[PDB]
Amino acid sequence: SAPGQAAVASAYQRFEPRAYLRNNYAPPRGDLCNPNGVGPWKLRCLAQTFATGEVSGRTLIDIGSGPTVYQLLSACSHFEDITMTDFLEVNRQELGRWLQEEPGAFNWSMYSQHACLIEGKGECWQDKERQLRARVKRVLPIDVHQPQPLGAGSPAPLPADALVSAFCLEAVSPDLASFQRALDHITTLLRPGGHLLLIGALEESWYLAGEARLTVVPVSEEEVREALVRSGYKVRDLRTYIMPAHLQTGVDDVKGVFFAWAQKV
Amino acid sequence: AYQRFEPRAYLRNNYAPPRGDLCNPNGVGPWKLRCLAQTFATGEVSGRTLIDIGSGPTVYQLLSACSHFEDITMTDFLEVNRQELGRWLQEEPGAFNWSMYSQHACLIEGKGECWQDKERQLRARVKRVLPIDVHQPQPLGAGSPAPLPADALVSAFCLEAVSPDLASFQRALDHITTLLRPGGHLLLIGALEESWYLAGEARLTVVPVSEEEVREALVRSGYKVRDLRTYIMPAHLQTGVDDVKGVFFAWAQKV
Numbered sequence: 181s182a183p184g185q186a187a188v189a190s191a192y193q194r195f196e197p198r199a200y201l202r203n204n205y206a207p208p209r210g211d212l213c214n215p216n217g218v219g220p221w222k223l224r225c226l227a228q229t230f231a232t233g234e235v236s237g238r239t240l241i242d243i244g245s246g247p248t249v250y251q252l253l254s255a256c257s258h259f260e261d262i263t264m265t266d267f268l269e270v271n272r273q274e275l276g277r278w279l280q281e282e283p284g285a286f287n288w289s290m291y292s293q294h295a296c297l298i299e300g301k302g303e304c305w306q307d308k309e310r311q312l313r314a315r316v317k318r319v320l321p322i323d324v325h326q327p328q329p330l331g332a333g334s335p336a337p338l339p340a341d342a343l344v345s346a347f348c349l350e351a352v353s354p355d356l357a358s359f360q361r362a363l364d365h366i367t368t369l370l371r372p373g374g375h376l377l378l379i380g381a382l383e384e385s386w387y388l389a390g391e392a393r394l395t396v397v398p399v400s401e402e403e404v405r406e407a408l409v410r411s412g413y414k415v416r417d418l419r420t421y422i423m424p425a426h427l428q429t430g431v432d433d434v435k436g437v438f439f440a441w442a443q444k445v
Numbered sequence: 446a447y448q449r450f451e452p453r454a455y456l457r458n459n460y461a462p463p464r465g466d467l468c469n470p471n472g473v474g475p476w477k478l479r480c481l482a483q484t485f486a487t488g489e490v491s492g493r494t495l496i497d498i499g500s501g502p503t504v505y506q507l508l509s510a511c512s513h514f515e516d517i518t519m520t521d522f523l524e525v526n527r528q529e530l531g532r533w534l535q536e537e538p539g540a541f542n543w544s545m546y547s548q549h550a551c552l553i554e555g556k557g558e559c560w561q562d563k564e565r566q567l568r569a570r571v572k573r574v575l576p577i578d579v580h581q582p583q584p585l586g587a588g589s590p591a592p593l594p595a596d597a598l599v600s601a602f603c604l605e606a607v608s609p610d611l612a613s614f615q616r617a618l619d620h621i622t623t624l625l626r627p628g629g630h631l632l633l634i635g636a637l638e639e640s641w642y643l644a645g646e647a648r649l650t651v652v653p654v655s656e657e658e659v660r661e662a663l664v665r666s667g668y669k670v671r672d673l674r675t676y677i678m679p680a681h682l683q684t685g686v687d688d689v690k691g692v693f694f695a696w697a698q699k700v
C-alpha cells in the first residue's frame with residue numbers, strides 16, 4: 181500500500197498551482213459563457229443541489245481544495261463554518277492569497293458572477309466572495325490516505341455536517357482499491373446522515389500541472405457508485421458530463437466528469 | 446454651458462460609488478436597470494430600430510433593450526460624449542468600465558446570460574453614434590443615417606437637463622416624438638425636482654419637474670402612459686453633485 185502512495189506524494193512535489201489554474205480554470209475550459217461547457221455544468225450541479233435546501237448545517241469540509249474556491253461558491257450560504265484543505269503547502273498559500281484579497285491572487289470573479297447568476301437571488305458577486313471569505317475558518321493540511329486524514333485532534337470541528345471534494349480522490353489514488361480506502365477515510369469525517377458532494381474525472385489516466393504529469397486512476401460512473409455504496413452512502417444523484425472534443429486539449433486525457441450527491445447512513 | 450461638460454466627471458459623479466454601487470438592491474442603479482428589464486420582459490416593446498436620445502457617455506440604458514432591437518442609434522449633443530461612447534463601443538484604451546452594469550442586467554433579466562455576451566450583443570447592434578439637438582424641430586437634422594421613423598426611443602436624463610423650463614421640456618419632447626413611429630414606444634428616465642447638477646467645471650441648470658408634470662407632458666405630446674413610477678432618492682445618495690429628489694421612469698406609447 182505504501183509504495184503507490186509514495187509515488188503519488190513524490191509526483192505532487194512538482195505540481196504547479198498556476199499552471200493547474202491555467203489548464204483548468206482559464207479559457208477554454210474556464211469559459212463560462214458557453215452553457216454547454218464544463219465550468220457551467222459543475223456550478224449548476226452544485227447550485228441545484230444546494231437549492232433543494234436538503235444540504236445544510238453548521239460545518240463543511242472541502243477535501244483537497246487545491247488552489248480553487250469555485251466548489252464552495254454555492255455552499256457558503258448554507259454553512260457558517262468552512263474548512264478548506266490540501267496536501268500541498270503551495271496550494272494552501274494560493275488560497276491564502278485569495279483569502280487576503282490580494283492582487284496576484286487568482287481571479288475567481290467570473291465564477292462568483294456565474295454562481296450568482298444561476299442561484300437566481302440577485303446577489304452581487306462581491307457580496308458572494310465576501311461571504312465565502314468570512315465563512316472559511318481555517319485552511320489545513322490533509323492526506324486522504326491516512327486513516328485520519330486531518331491528523332490527530334485536528335483543529336477542524338468533527339464530525340462535519342457536509343463534505344465537498346472535487347477532483348481529489350481519483351487524482352491521488354494509484355488504483356481503485358486506494359480510491360475506495362480514501363473514500364472510507366474521509367467518510368470518517370462526516371456525521372451519519374451528513375452529505376458528500378463529489379466531483380471528479382471519469383476514465384482519466386493523467387493530467388498536467390506544469391512540469392508535473394500526474395498519474396490518475398481511471399474510474400467509471402459504475403465504479404464511483406459502487407464505491408459510495410461500499411463506504412456506507414445512499415446515492416441521491418450521480419450525473420455525467422461528456423467532455424466535448426474541443427475541450428479535449430492536451431492538459432489531460434479525461435473523457436467526462438461526474439457529480440455525485442451522497443448521503444451517509 | 447454644456448461646452449464645459451466633462452464626461453469623466455459626470456461618470457464619476459453618477460456611475461461610480463455610492464450612486465454606482467449596484468450591490469444594494471435599494472440603490473438607484475438597480476432600480477433603473479429593473480425598470481428597463483421588466484419593461485422589455487413584457488414583450489410589448491419590440492421592432493427593428495431604436496434610437497437612444499441624449500446618450501451622453503453611458504450605455505447602461507441599452508443593456509436590456511439591445512436583445513429586442515437589431516439596429517440601434519445612440520446620440521449626443523456633444524462630440525466629447527460621442528468619443529467616450531466610441532471608446533467603449535470599439536473596446537479602445539481607457540474606455541469606461543460598464544461591466545458591473547452588464548453583470549447586473551444579466552442577473553436581473555434571469556436568462557442565465559453571461560455579461561460578455563450581453564456587451565457583445567450591445568456593441569454589435571449599435572450601428573452608429575450621431576449628433577443630436579432636441580431643441581431642433583428635426584433633432585437629427587435632415588437626411589440622417591438613422592432609419593426613421595424608429596420603432597422605439599429611449600431617453601434617460603436628457604430632456605429636463607437641457608430645458609430651462611416646463612415649456613421647453615414639452616417642446617423638446619414634441620420634437621423627439623417626431624422620430625417615433627405611431628404605435629411605437631418611448632422609455633423615458635429622468636430626474637425629479639432637480640434644479641442643477643455638476644459635471645466637472647460645468648454647472649448645469651435643470652428644470653425641476655414632478656411626476657404629474659411628466660405625465661401631463663407625455664399626454665400632450667400624444668402618448669398613452671403605460672407606466673410611470675418614482676424612486677425617492679435616499680439620503681445616503683444625496684451628495685454634492687446635484688440636488689435631485691427622485692428619479693422617474695415612464696413607459697409611453699405613441700398614438
Ligand SMILES: Nc1ncnc2c1ncn2[C@@H]1O[C@@H](CSCCNC[C@@H]2Cc3ccc([N+](=O)[O-])cc3CN2)[C@@H](O)[C@H]1O
Pocket residue numbers: 188189192195204209218219222243244245246247266267268271322323324325346347348351352381384387396432434437
Ligand atoms: N494524499 C493527498 N490527500 C489529499 N489531497 C491530495 C493528496 N495528494 C495530492 N493532493 C491534492 O489533490 C490535488 C487535486 S487537484 C485536481 C486533480 N484532478 C485531476 C485532473 C484536474 C482537473 C480539474 C478540473 C477539471 N475540469 O474539467 O473542471 C478536470 C480535471 C482533470 N483531472 C491537489 O490539490 C493535490 O495537492
Ligand SMILES: Nc1ncnc2c1ncn2[C@@H]1O[C@@H](CSCCNC[C@@H]2Cc3ccc([N+](=O)[O-])cc3CN2)[C@@H](O)[C@H]1O
Pocket residue numbers: 447450459464473474477498499500501502521522523526577578579580601602603606607636639642687689692
Ligand atoms: N440640446 C441637446 N440635445 C440633446 N442632448 C443634449 C443637448 N444639450 C445637452 N445634451 C446632452 O444631454 C446630457 C444628458 S446627461 C446629464 C443629465 N443631467 C441630469 C443629472 C444626471 C443624473 C444621472 C443619474 C442620476 N441617477 O441618480 O441615476 C441622477 C442624475 C441627476 N441629474 C448630456 O449628455 C448632454 O450632452
